[PDB]
């Protein structure tokens, strides 16, 4: 029978099945109805990014973010938000800053202002994103180049102070094989950071997958969970071709990792995906559940 994957994953002891969205999606088509029926958590695709919220220094705006947070409260959904510190959606005024202390203070103020506005309401903040190169070294974004590698400690310490009850995550992509240097490096660095007292509660795996990659996640996710964070999660999930096999493998990986709290997909219906031609989502363009959705339902019985 037609069922909600969020309700089913909750019945298997996980916290949520979630989806990325924003005001532009919710005011059109069938998105809001499907999200309400089948998902338990929303995340803003773009409205909480740096460009949207702080387009010039100290001059904040929350139009889209408030829309989504208020919608989630109104509609009984959990909220995740981010990314506080990454190189995407980063307005050039930030990446033009040339000195350590200036950028520290700008970064701290950005983190604190966003987290304070929504204090107590947000389950998970993605504090640091896409911090690694594929070889496992740290990505030379403006934060690393100007602050240095202490930017990661600082970002998490600041986030904990702004809202101690949010779960604080680092997230990255291409963490999908236990044999890949990037997956190994984020584990080694998170272990280091935690031993130094950096408050990293979660590793989020950004699973923008090609066909056949699901199987590798079965061993990659427990490797990520070995860094000792209280949580791991799957986010930004889509799969080229949307094979039931790939989706069921990802779900099984989360089921088999005690610290995996849930799974968030990148969107609702295929033609609205940034990767629409790969039909990589769980609903087709008529907003009907696809074979992969039905396979997830079957797998969560």
Author numbering: 2 to 302
From the article:
Here, we investigate the molecular origins of the nearly billionfold rate enhancement achieved by directed evolution of the computationally designed Kemp eliminase HG3 (7). The Kemp elimination is a well-studied model for proton transfer from carbon that has served as a benchmark for de novo design. Although the first-generation HG3 design is significantly more efficient than an “off-the-shelf” catalyst like bovine serum albumin, its specific activity was further increased 200-fold over 17 rounds of mutagenesis and screening. All HG3 variants have an inactive conformational sub-state, rooted in the original protein scaffold, which was gradually supplanted with a catalytically competent sub-state as evolution progressed.
Cryogenic structures of HG3 and HG3.7 in the absence of a ligand revealed that β-strands 6 and 7 (located adjacent to the binding pocket), adopt two distinct backbone conformations whereas only a single conformer is observed for HG3.17. Estimating the respective populations from the volumes of duplicated cross peaks shows that the inactive species comprises ~25% of the HG3 and HG3.7 samples at 25 °C, but only 5% of HG3.17. Because the sparsely populated inactive sub-state of HG3.17 was not detected in the cryogenic X-ray structure, we set up crystal screens under conditions favoring this conformation (pH 10 and 37 °C). The other 15 mutations in HG3.17 had a relatively small effect on kcat (3-fold), but increased kcat/KM 10-fold by lowering KM; they also largely eliminated the inactive conformational sub-state and decreased product inhibition.
